[PDB]
Amino acid sequence: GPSVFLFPPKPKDTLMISRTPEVTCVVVDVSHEDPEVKFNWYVDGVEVHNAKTKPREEQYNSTYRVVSVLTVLHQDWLNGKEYKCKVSNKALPAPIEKTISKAKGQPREPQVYTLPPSRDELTKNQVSLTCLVKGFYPSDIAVEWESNGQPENNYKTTPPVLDSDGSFFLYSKLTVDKSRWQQGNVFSCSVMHEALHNHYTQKSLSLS
Amino acid sequence: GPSVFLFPPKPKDTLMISRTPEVTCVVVDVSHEDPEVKFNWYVDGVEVHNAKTKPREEQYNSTYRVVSVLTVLHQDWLNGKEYKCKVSNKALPAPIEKTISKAKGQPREPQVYTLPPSRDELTKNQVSLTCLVKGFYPSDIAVEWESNGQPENNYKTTPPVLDSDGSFFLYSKLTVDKSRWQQGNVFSCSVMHEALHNHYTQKSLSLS
Numbered sequence: 205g206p207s208v209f210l211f212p213p214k215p216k217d218t219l220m221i222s223r224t225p226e227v228t229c230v231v232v233d234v235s236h237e238d239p240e241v242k243f244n245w246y247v248d249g250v251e252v253h254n255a256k257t258k259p260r261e262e263q264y265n266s267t268y269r270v271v272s273v274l275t276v277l278h279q280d281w282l283n284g285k286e287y288k289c290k291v292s293n294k295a296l297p298a299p300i301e302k303t304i305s306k307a308k309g310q311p312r313e314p315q316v317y318t319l320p321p322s323r324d325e326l327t328k329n330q331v332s333l334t335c336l337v338k339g340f341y342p343s344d345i346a347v348e349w350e351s352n353g354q355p356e357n358n359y360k361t362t363p364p365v366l367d368s369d370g371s372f373f374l375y376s377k378l379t380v381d382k383s384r385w386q387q388g389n390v391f392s393c394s395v396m397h398e399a400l401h402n403h404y405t406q407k408s409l410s411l412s
Numbered sequence: 413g414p415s416v417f418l419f420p421p422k423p424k425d426t427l428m429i430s431r432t433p434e435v436t437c438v439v440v441d442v443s444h445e446d447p448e449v450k451f452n453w454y455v456d457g458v459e460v461h462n463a464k465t466k467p468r469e470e471q472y473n474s475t476y477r478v479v480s481v482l483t484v485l486h487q488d489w490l491n492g493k494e495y496k497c498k499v500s501n502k503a504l505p506a507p508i509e510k511t512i513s514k515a516k517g518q519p520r521e522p523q524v525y526t527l528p529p530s531r532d533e534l535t536k537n538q539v540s541l542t543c544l545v546k547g548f549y550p551s552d553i554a555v556e557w558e559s560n561g562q563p564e565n566n567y568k569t570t571p572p573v574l575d576s577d578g579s580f581f582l583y584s585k586l587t588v589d590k591s592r593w594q595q596g597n598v599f600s601c602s603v604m605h606e607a608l609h610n611h612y613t614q615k616s617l618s619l620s
């Protein structure tokens with residue numbers, strides 16, 4: 205038979221009121237031979253009726269991928285409500301439920317430190333600007349870079365890693381032309397997380 | 413029916429001559445109704461017969477688990493040989509095959525850069541010492557920290573992360589008591605990877 209995977213909203217979406225946070229139910233391996241899929245959604249137990257049940261894509265294995273989507277209240281998600289996605293594709297002897305909720309526990313504020321390039325990287329053409337983000341809980345977080353209020357794109361951020369004290373840390377690495385590190389521009393790492401004031405903080409970095 | 417899982421050697425094992433690298437072929441969900449399992453092992457598609465196959469073990473869920481281990485030559489792994497585990501069992505229409513090899517791609521030398529604490533971190537109980545390792549390929553790598561010849565302990569290393577040029581990077585974080593960094597003390601981040609001479613480098617860090 206077909207299987208089911210349930211997904212949390214993107215971290216940035218729950219933290220900024222402008223954005224629309226969603227839980228996503230993904231039904232995989234649904235066959236032509238019995239292709240109709242049903243969904244039912246529950247918050248904290250109660251059936252609600254906000255979900256859209258968007259259709260419906262091909263595949264290599266010629267099986268299907270049926271995806272349903274539910275919008276969620278920012279504060280609900282952050283207060284720990286659990287979301288139940290229920291899938292009925294008879295071909296299923298009984299319908300599948302899956303449940304998801306935010307990680308439990310006292311949210312902890314990230315500490316953010318920008319670290320300049322090593323001396324030895326300076327004999328290169330591009331240099332690495334590093335943002336260390338640590339001491340945060342839960343692991344939901346977003347990190348971005350900018351300069352002169354314009355986004356930097358050439359950066360990569362590690363996944364959150366569980367640290368020895370049970371909090372998380374990560375690093376983000378921005379690569380810039382050494383031209384710019386010397387020509388003196390200011391660069392900033394922005395962090396969004398629920399335990400920050402206004403869910404956001406920014407730390408700057410430039411040549412001292 | 414039965415599932416097969418094929419595990420690569422540990423990065424350290426293929427990189428150090430003193431160690432012994434093994435590929436491990438594990439079969440789970442073997443039934444009582446058909447408990448016989450047969451392994452065949454192939455290196456670049458040539459059958460080999462020096463694997464060591466352990467007597468099957470009944471699990472608590474009343475299925476058997478059976479393991480076969482093939483010692484591989486360091487040079488063969490690093491030269492990219494493909495290792496095929498073939499598993500036969502009278503409950504399959506046809507044998508299951510898994511193959512594993514080192515990541516294909518030109519290997520690339522890691523660059524190692526040490527980064528001292530952000531000054532903002534001084535007002536802390538403890539402090540973070542950063543080791544950036546970038547530009548390496550394949551992603552198989554090992555990282556450790558020591559000082560005065562003896563291993564630290566209190567460190568965590570991110571998974572390798574795909575960078576925008578197709579090499580990998582990671583960071584490893586070592587936390588030490590603020591006094592020690594202030595005591596003039598000297599730490600070393602050491603890295604092992606196939607594109608290093610003697611498969612090893614180490615870079616030091618101390619309060620300047």
Ligand SMILES: *[C@@H]1O[C@H](CO[C@@H]2O[C@@H](C)[C@@H](O)[C@@H](O)[C@@H]2O)[C@@H](O[C@@H]2O[C@H](CO)[C@@H](O[C@@H]3O[C@H](CO[C@H]4O[C@H](CO)[C@@H](O)[C@H](O)[C@@H]4O[C@@H]4O[C@H](CO)[C@@H](O)[C@H](O)[C@H]4NC(C)=O)[C@@H](O)[C@H](O[C@H]4O[C@H](CO)[C@@H](O)[C@H](O)[C@@H]4O[C@@H]4O[C@H](CO)[C@@H](O)[C@H](O)[C@H]4NC(C)=O)[C@@H]3O)[C@H](O)[C@H]2NC(C)=O)[C@H](O)[C@H]1NC(C)=O
Pocket residue numbers: 209211212228230232233263264265267269
């Ligand atoms: C036929 O085709 C379909 C099409 O899929 C693929 O399409 C092509 C192009 C190739 O990529 C092929 O791989 C494949 O053919 C196949 O569909 C696949 O079905 C498999 C199952 O076999 C699914 O695997 C699961 O993946 C989820 C997470 O997947 C996310 O990320 C994927 C990339 O990594 C991405 O492909 C997915 O789209 C999905 O992406 C997320 O999607 C949402 C909404 O779109 C989005 O909001 C996210 O931002 C996005 N994230 C991205 C893009 O990165 C994974 O969670 C599953 O792992 C759990 O379950 C496994 C058991 O199956 C288990 O082994 C794991 O350990 C894990 O188990 C969980 O573990 C935690 C603890 O860690 C525990 O708490 C949980 O209880 C536990 N759950 C358990 C036990 O189940 C799983 O690996 C693929 O997603 C899916 N691919 C697609 C595109 O949908 C299908 O298999 C084919 N059929 C065949 C070959 O017969």
Ligand SMILES: *[C@@H]1O[C@H](CO[C@@H]2O[C@@H](C)[C@@H](O)[C@@H](O)[C@@H]2O)[C@@H](O[C@@H]2O[C@H](CO)[C@@H](O[C@@H]3O[C@H](CO[C@H]4O[C@H](CO)[C@@H](O)[C@H](O)[C@@H]4O[C@@H]4O[C@H](CO)[C@@H](O)[C@H](O)[C@H]4NC(C)=O)[C@@H](O)[C@H](O[C@H]4O[C@H](CO)[C@@H](O)[C@H](O)[C@@H]4O[C@@H]4O[C@H](CO)[C@@H](O)[C@H](O)[C@H]4NC(C)=O)[C@@H]3O)[C@H](O)[C@H]2NC(C)=O)[C@H](O)[C@H]1NC(C)=O
Pocket residue numbers: 415417419436438440441471472473475477
């Ligand atoms: C009956 O019981 C057995 C045995 O379980 C034991 O007994 C029972 C009664 C209970 O008490 C259990 O608690 C107890 O553990 C069950 O057997 C299990 O079967 C599951 C599958 O259902 C297997 O899952 C796979 O696990 C591997 C990783 O497994 C390693 O790590 C485990 C700890 O996390 C560890 O328990 C295992 O022993 C194993 O350990 C490694 O072993 C090697 C070899 O000795 C060793 O060198 C390593 O050092 C060691 N590692 C460590 C840290 O210990 C996982 O990788 C598998 O994931 C792949 O497949 C999934 C689909 O099944 C897929 O969703 C995943 O994404 C992934 O797919 C892969 O994706 C990645 C890319 O991200 C890539 O690697 C691959 O290319 C890709 N492959 C595929 C398929 O596309 C998978 O989760 C358990 O290992 C296994 N337990 C044991 C001990 O063997 C059994 O399920 C029970 N049966 C029933 C019906 O209940």
